[PDB]
Each structure stands twice: as C-alpha cells, then as structure tokens.
A paper describes a structure:
GH76 enzymes catalyse the hydrolysis of α‐1,6‐mannans, such as those found in the yeast cell wall, with net retention of anomeric configuration.
In the case of GH76 α‐mannanases, not least because of the potential issues with S‐oligosaccharides described by Belz and colleagues, we chose to synthesise cyclophellitol di‐ and trisaccharides 1 and 2, respectively, and to render the latter less hydrolysable through the incorporation of a carba sugar moiety (as in 3). Having shown that a trisaccharide inhibitor would bind successfully when the enzyme was inactive for normal hydrolysis, we then sought to study the binding of the trisaccharide 3, which we postulated would be non‐hydrolysable by virtue of containing a central carbacycle, to both WT and, as a control, D125 N enzymes. As with reported complexes involving competitive inhibitors, interactions in the −3 and −2 subsites are mainly via hydrogen bonds with Trp172, Asn181, Asp228, Arg229, Asp239, and Tyr243. Although crystal structures are clearly indicative that the carbacycle containing inhibitor 3 reacted, as expected, with the wild‐type enzyme, and that 2 only reacts well with the D125 N variant, we sought to verify these structural observations through mass spectrometry in solution. Our results thus prove our working hypothesis to bear out: effective mechanism‐based endoglycosidase inhibitors can be designed taking into account stabilization of internal glycosidic linkages through the employment of carbacyclic entities.
Author numbering: 38 to 353, 355 to 375
Write the structure that this text describes.
C-alpha cells in the first residue's frame, strides 16, 4: 500500500467528474479543467496506474485513461489541429502515445502520430533561429520550450512504439536545437526565443522538466552518455534555482499555466532518479538528488488538508477552495515512475 494510492484516490474524489469524464478545475465542481492541463492530469492518471499495486485503484485508473480521452473528445472533437497553440496539440499527442503504450488501443497511436506529424512536419522551421518548432500555427513570432521539448518527448514515445527511426531522428533534431538555442548549455532552460528580442532566459519547473525527460529518453534510445549528463546538469540547475531558501521547489502561481508546473517537473525528475539509482551513474549526485526529492515530497505532504489534498504552494491553504492543477503536483510526487 502507498501514500500515492491515498493521494490519487483523494484527488479523484475531490476533482473527477464521472458524468462529463473530465476533471473539475477546482473543488467547487463548477467548470472543467483547461484543455492542455487536462492532458497533464491524464498523464497523472497514467503515472498512478503504473505506480499502484492496489487492484481496485489499478483497474479504476486503467478505465479512467479511456474515460479522460472520451470526455475531452466529446467536448473538443478528435482533431485538435485547428487549435492555434502547437503546445496544446503536442501535450495531447504525448498523452496519446502513453495511452497507447498502456492500453494497445489503436485510436491512441493514430491520435499521437497524426497530431505529432502535423506539428513537426508543418511547424519545424530553419529560417528563424536555425531550427525549432513555432509556438503557434497562426502567427510565427516565437519558438518555445513548452512546445519543443514536449515534441521531443512525444517523438521518443512514438519511436519506442513504432521502432520507426524517423521519430528518433525527429526527437534528436528537436532536442539538439533546443539545447543549443533554448538553454545556456549548462542546464538552464530558456522559456522561448522571439524574433524581436531573442532568447528569454526565464526558467520554470515545466520547461526544466520536459528538457530533463527528453534528455533521459534520448539517453535510453541512443546510449549516448551526453544526454544523461544534460539531464543531470538541468536537475542541478533546478534544485539550486527553482527552490525557496530551504530547498523546497518554488510556487510559480498565480500564473494559471505555471502554478501546477511542479506536476510536469516531478514526473520527469522521477525518470532521472530511477535511471541514476538503477545504473549507479553520477553516484554522488544521485544520493544528493534522492535526499532532496524525499525532502520535497515530505514537505509537500506535511501540508495536506483533512481530505489528503495538497495545494501547490508547498511552503504552507486554509481558504477551503483547492484547484486541480495546483493540487496535482503532490499526487504526482507520490506516483513517480
């Protein structure tokens, strides 16, 4: 049995809508979650499905993988390519690849491949910044970490599924460009690069996270040690910069997109943690990293309410109203794979 079980059960009890097959945005159960965040809650369901050995929770979560998809398709349709936000398309392409791995349901591989191919085949460009995927498919003014590294990750899942080297080539070309043009080369991931004023070196949890995850995935697909080093350097930056003075990961609210970003960070830190624990690579860092992760999980869960819900401000919420994105990160932290 696990604290991850309790945390995921509580999350579903608080925020899941079995009628609309969608998460509520908050504990008042009034409006459903925003499109892209819903794909990140979809992945938390998947993470908890992989983490749990509770037979009731395992079967519920496996069903819920299908339900989340059906709720979203019922509202937004099956074809997300009319969404101007390439990031929206890619967060759901990545979720769909993972759903295929778990379920074997062909609809998910079609959704993943079709949506990924639309973004990468049409939104990759070498005229601005020597490479990279555009943020939007309407106006082309910026290329962003929050599309490019998720795209590398989606490509890696698609290579794992298909064994089509095209997807390894894509993952590698996207990551290589992103490391060059959206990082300092030393683990700091820049938000975006804009035509007018160039690189915007604002780092955040979710962009550290997708860079770490795509580097770990490239390490596993290629065996090239540089990708594991890239992940370690980005984890070091995260733990010394995106933390309070006590070492607890930051709160990036009140921005609605960022406030839940620890969810995506913790998901990807878990991949690095597992690779280093299992391989005995970077043993000094691995030990420090594991201690810091344990410390963060302990501090988050120390601030659970009586319903076992943890607000995303892990430094301290007594207002009675909890949000599903902000609250997700603590559940993710206890469901790492």
């Amino acid at each position: 049995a696990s604290d991850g079980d309790t945390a995921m059960k509580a999350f579903n009890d608080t925020f899941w809508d079995p009628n609309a097959k969608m998460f509520w945005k908050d504990s008042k159960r009034e409006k459903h979650q925003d499109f892209w965040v819903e794909a990140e809650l979809w992945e938390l369901v998947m993470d908890a499905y992989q983490h749990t050995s509770d037979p009731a929770l395992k079967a519920e979560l496996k069903t819920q993988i299908d339900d989340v998809y059906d709720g979203t398709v019922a509202k937004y349709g099956q074809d997300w390519t009319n969404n101007p936000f390439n990031d929206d398309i890619m967060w759901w392409a990545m979720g769909s690849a993972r759903a295929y791995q778990i379920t074997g349901n062909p609809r998910y591989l079609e959704a993943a491949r079709d949506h990924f191919d639309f973004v990468y085949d049409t939104q990759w460009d070498e005229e601005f910044a020597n490479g990279g995927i555009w943020w939007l498919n309407s106006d082309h003014n910026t290329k962003n970490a929050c599309i490019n590294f998720p795209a590398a990750q989606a490509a890696l899942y698609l290579y794992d599924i298909t064994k089509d080297e095209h997807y390894l080539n894509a993952a590698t070309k996207i990551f290589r460009w992103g490391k060059t043009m959206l990082t300092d080369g030393n683990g700091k991931v820049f938000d975006r690069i804009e035509i007018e004023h160039g690189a915007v070196p604002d780092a955040t949890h979710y962009n550290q996270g997708t860079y770490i995850g795509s580097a770990v995935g490239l390490y596993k697909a290629t065996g090239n040690a540089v990708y594991l080093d890239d992940a370690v350097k980005a984890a070091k930056f995260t733990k010394n910069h995106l933390v309070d003075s006590n070492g607890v990961l930051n709160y990036e609210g009140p921005n609605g997109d960022l406030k839940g970003g620890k969810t995506i960070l913790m998901r990807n830190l878990a991949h690095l943690q597992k690779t280093l624990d299992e391989t005995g690579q970077y043993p000094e860092f691995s030990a420090e990293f594991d201690e810091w992760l344990a410390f963060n999980i302990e501090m988050a869960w120390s601030h659970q309410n009586s319903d076992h819900i943890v607000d995303g401000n892990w430094a301290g919420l007594l207002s009675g109203t909890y949000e599903s994105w902000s609250s997700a990160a603590a559940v993710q932290a206890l469901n790492g794979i």
